Design an enzyme around this catalytic site. Structure first.
Site, PDB file in Angstrom:
ATOM      1  N   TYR A  25       0.784  -1.223  -0.218  1.00  6.13           N
ATOM      2  CA  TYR A  25      -0.109   0.055   0.090  1.00  6.13           C
ATOM      3  C   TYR A  25       0.987   1.379   0.003  1.00  6.13           C
ATOM      4  CZ  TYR A  25      -4.163  -2.916   1.136  1.00  6.13           C
ATOM      5  OH  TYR A  25      -4.966  -4.112   1.061  1.00  6.13           O
ATOM      6  N   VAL A  94      -5.270  -5.077   8.548  1.00  7.30           N
ATOM      7  CA  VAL A  94      -6.265  -6.209   8.549  1.00  7.30           C
ATOM      8  C   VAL A  94      -6.661  -6.331   7.106  1.00  7.30           C
ATOM      9  CG1 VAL A  94      -8.562  -6.697   8.753  1.00  7.30           C
ATOM     10  CG2 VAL A  94      -7.539  -5.221  10.489  1.00  7.30           C
ATOM     11  N   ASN A 131      -4.566   8.661   4.086  1.00  9.30           N
ATOM     12  CA  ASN A 131      -5.309   7.636   4.340  1.00  9.30           C
ATOM     13  C   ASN A 131      -6.341   7.942   5.080  1.00  9.30           C
ATOM     14  OD1 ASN A 131      -5.267   4.540   3.826  1.00  9.30           O
ATOM     15  ND2 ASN A 131      -5.226   4.314   6.125  1.00  9.30           N
ATOM     16  N   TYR A 138      -9.708   5.948  13.511  1.00 11.41           N
ATOM     17  CA  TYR A 138      -8.850   6.475  14.799  1.00 11.41           C
ATOM     18  C   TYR A 138      -9.492   7.641  15.460  1.00 11.41           C
ATOM     19  CZ  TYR A 138      -5.132   3.253  13.581  1.00 11.41           C
ATOM     20  OH  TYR A 138      -4.148   2.045  13.136  1.00 11.41           O
TER      21      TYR A 138
HETATM   22  C1  COA Z   1      -8.810   1.189   9.237  1.00 13.37           C
HETATM   23  C2  COA Z   1      -9.185  -0.289   9.409  1.00 13.37           C
HETATM   24  C3  COA Z   1      -7.390  -0.896   9.855  1.00 13.37           C
HETATM   25  C4  COA Z   1      -9.760  -0.946  10.723  1.00 13.37           C
HETATM   26  O1  COA Z   1      -9.674  -2.282  10.760  1.00 13.37           O
HETATM   27  P1  COA Z   1     -11.507  -3.107  10.634  1.00 13.37           P
HETATM   28  O2  COA Z   1     -11.039  -4.660  10.847  1.00 13.37           O
HETATM   29  O3  COA Z   1     -11.953  -3.050   9.425  1.00 13.37           O
HETATM   30  O4  COA Z   1     -11.979  -2.468  11.751  1.00 13.37           O
HETATM   31  P2  COA Z   1     -13.716  -2.614  12.355  1.00 13.37           P
HETATM   32  O5  COA Z   1     -14.087  -3.767  11.623  1.00 13.37           O
HETATM   33  O6  COA Z   1     -13.619  -2.676  13.614  1.00 13.37           O
HETATM   34  O7  COA Z   1     -14.414  -1.236  11.687  1.00 13.37           O
HETATM   35  C5  COA Z   1     -13.768  -0.144  11.122  1.00 13.37           C
HETATM   36  C6  COA Z   1     -14.525   0.717  10.073  1.00 13.37           C
HETATM   37  O8  COA Z   1     -14.963   0.413   9.032  1.00 13.37           O
HETATM   38  C7  COA Z   1     -16.069   1.023   8.681  1.00 13.37           C
HETATM   39  N1  COA Z   1     -16.948   0.192   8.052  1.00 13.37           N
HETATM   40  C8  COA Z   1     -17.502  -1.256   8.264  1.00 13.37           C
HETATM   41  N2  COA Z   1     -18.126  -1.721   7.118  1.00 13.37           N
HETATM   42  C9  COA Z   1     -17.922  -1.044   6.306  1.00 13.37           C
HETATM   43  C10 COA Z   1     -18.806  -1.008   4.892  1.00 13.37           C
HETATM   44  N3  COA Z   1     -19.480  -1.978   4.572  1.00 13.37           N
HETATM   45  N4  COA Z   1     -18.427   0.135   4.189  1.00 13.37           N
HETATM   46  C11 COA Z   1     -17.709   1.131   4.651  1.00 13.37           C
HETATM   47  N5  COA Z   1     -17.021   1.425   5.804  1.00 13.37           N
HETATM   48  C12 COA Z   1     -17.292   0.269   6.615  1.00 13.37           C
HETATM   49  C13 COA Z   1     -17.021   1.288  10.018  1.00 13.37           C
HETATM   50  O9  COA Z   1     -17.743   2.376  10.094  1.00 13.37           O
HETATM   51  C14 COA Z   1     -15.740   1.319  10.933  1.00 13.37           C
HETATM   52  O10 COA Z   1     -15.073   2.821  11.513  1.00 13.37           O
HETATM   53  P3  COA Z   1     -16.161   3.401  12.635  1.00 13.37           P
HETATM   54  O11 COA Z   1     -16.532   2.192  13.653  1.00 13.37           O
HETATM   55  O12 COA Z   1     -15.190   4.328  13.281  1.00 13.37           O
HETATM   56  O13 COA Z   1     -17.250   4.079  11.867  1.00 13.37           O
HETATM   57  C15 COA Z   1      -9.346  -1.086   8.043  1.00 13.37           C
HETATM   58  O14 COA Z   1     -10.729  -1.061   7.952  1.00 13.37           O
HETATM   59  C16 COA Z   1      -8.877  -0.548   6.777  1.00 13.37           C
HETATM   60  O15 COA Z   1      -7.490  -0.837   6.527  1.00 13.37           O
HETATM   61  N6  COA Z   1      -9.219   0.163   6.027  1.00 13.37           N
HETATM   62  C17 COA Z   1      -8.976   0.864   4.641  1.00 13.37           C
HETATM   63  C18 COA Z   1      -9.933   1.362   3.814  1.00 13.37           C
HETATM   64  C19 COA Z   1     -11.092   0.161   3.678  1.00 13.37           C
HETATM   65  O16 COA Z   1     -10.675  -1.223   3.631  1.00 13.37           O
HETATM   66  N7  COA Z   1     -12.343   0.506   3.917  1.00 13.37           N
HETATM   67  C20 COA Z   1     -12.999   0.202   5.277  1.00 13.37           C
HETATM   68  C21 COA Z   1     -14.069  -0.725   4.902  1.00 13.37           C
HETATM   69  S1  COA Z   1     -14.799  -2.005   6.035  1.00 13.37           S
END
Ligand code: COA
Ligand code: COA
Lengths: 162, 163
Positions: A25, A94, A131, A138
């Site tokens: 990334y 993740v 990002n 966060y």
């Molecule tokens: C930031 C990150 C490290 C957190 O890890 P994670 O395992 O996904 O964490 P969680 O499952 O606990 O949820 C994190 C978030 O995704 C968002 N999320 C969950 N399902 C979602 C979907 N279908 N579409 C968009 N966002 C979504 C949530 O709103 C949540 O953030 P918030 O509770 O502050 O609003 C990871 O999501 C990441 O690398 N994201 C990069 C962008 C991406 O993949 N988009 C997120 C889609 S899930």
């Protein structure tokens, strides 16, 4: 659905894989020179230089290639001359298909517990300005923004100074 | 003239004093919420959260207030997922009246010896971007310059998540 737990020596290969995935990334996978041996030696000897939390999922949920680890956090403790002990989060990732289920939140939850156990005053970490996702992730959890330049003296010279 | 040795629980009172004298330059010696108690527990408890090297001068060269410690370096080991363990120099200071004799250079030789012992691949540290003399002081010692945003999640919030 998934288990967040401390890493073990046999997780090192999975940890290296994710570190590298994280380096894609950034478009610099070839920059990772650490091996599975370095990670085992540096994280599971008498004095670990880092600590890791990993996300392990059940067999019917492993990756197609057969990996059981789909997320991790690498951290260590630092010290600040004004406020003291801190928990420094170095890496956090993740895998794509395992995002959205609460793995990241569970990992941050375990990191918070490690911090309160340490009697650490705060958890610090870096985030790319571009990002936004990670930022909003966060921020919704209490994170807030916190003119010096990072210099480096390599072993080459350190050996000379010695 | 002087001697650089690792710190002890006894020097914590002096380490604090130096931490504050350094902060004074920014008129923020009140930002230091750490006390001698903290430095002793954090540094000489079952788990050292930092390490310090102090500069000690003989009675003949004590300070006006009668202190033998005129400088220090605070460091700890960090890790980079791409290259491995690093020695991180957090603070490095030498009382003004005492710089220019070679105390800092002596402290760097010791930190270098620790780095070789740790088998650390490098020693990282922060330098004031605007500070020219400082930068060159390091560039003369092999140092080379290296869009991320620093964040923090304070105690209140950590407690929320941890419960
Ligand atoms: C930031 C990150 C490290 C957190 O890890 P994670 O395992 O996904 O964490 P969680 O499952 O606990 O949820 C994190 C978030 O995704 C968002 N999320 C969950 N399902 C979602 C979907 N279908 N579409 C968009 N966002 C979504 C949530 O709103 C949540 O953030 P918030 O509770 O502050 O609003 C990871 O999501 C990441 O690398 N994201 C990069 C962008 C991406 O993949 N988009 C997120 C889609 S899930
Ligand atoms: C940066 C610092 C730690 C260096 O320590 P120091 O006590 O000054 O160390 P030194 O005396 O060895 O400094 C080296 C210099 O002093 C002079 N010096 C040292 N030993 C010498 C000797 N034997 N003969 C002649 N000159 C000598 C030299 O000009 C030399 O510079 P060079 O080595 O690049 O040629 C100190 O200046 C200080 O604490 N900084 C100012 C406070 C501050 O705001 N900064 C802290 C942020 S890190």
């Amino acid at each position: 659905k998934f288990k967040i737990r401390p890493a073990t020596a046999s997780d090192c290969s999975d940890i290296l894989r994710l570190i590298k995935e994280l380096a894609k990334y950034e478009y610099m996978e070839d920059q990772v020179i650490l091996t599975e041996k370095d990670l085992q030696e540096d994280g599971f000897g008498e004095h670990p230089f880092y600590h890791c939390l990993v996300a392990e999922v059940p067999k019917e949920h492993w990756t197609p290639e057969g990996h059981s680890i789909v997320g991790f956090a690498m951290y260590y403790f630092t010290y600040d001359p004004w406020i003291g002990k801190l928990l420094y989060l170095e890496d956090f990732f993740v895998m794509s298909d395992y995002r959205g289920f609460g793995i990241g939140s569970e990992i941050l939850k375990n990191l918070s517990q490690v911090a309160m156990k340490c009697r650490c005053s705060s958890m610090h970490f870096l985030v790319a300005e571009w990002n936004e996702p990670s930022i909003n992730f966060y921020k919704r959890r209490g994170a807030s923004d916190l003119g010096w330049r990072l210099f480096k003296i390599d072993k080459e010279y350190l050996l000379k100074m010695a």
